[PDB]
């Protein structure tokens, strides 16, 4: 029995990951934050 539950359990994770783009919320955030800071850091150049 347990094999089926486990093996089936994995399958959901694929699809729980395949479509829900909000699954990787944390990682995508960190890259987002750093990218923004650089923009702000770069954009400050054009200020008198």
């Amino acid at each position: 029995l347990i094999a089926n539950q486990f093996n089936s359990a994995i399958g959901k994770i694929q699809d729980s990951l395949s479509s829900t783009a909000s699954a990787l919320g944390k990682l995508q955030d960190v890259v987002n934050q750093n990218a923004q800071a650089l923009n702000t850091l770069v954009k400050q150049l054009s200020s008198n």
Partner: protein, 49 residues
């Protein structure tokens, strides 16, 4: 010149870098382009459009 660090000056627009022929297709009235960072990225040779 091309492909060498130089101090280019375009119609009064200056800067430093390497100049190569681009691939971007401006609209004819568009003079010169830029980047997300407002930084100069593209130029149009005024004498060589």
């Amino acid at each position: 010149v091309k492909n060498k660090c130089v101090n280019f000056n375009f119609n009064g627009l200056t800067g430093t870098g390497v100049l190569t022929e681009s691939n971007k297709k401006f609209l004819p009235f568009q003079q010169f382009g830029r980047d997300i960072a407002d930084t100069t990225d593209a130029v149009r040779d005024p004498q060589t459009l």
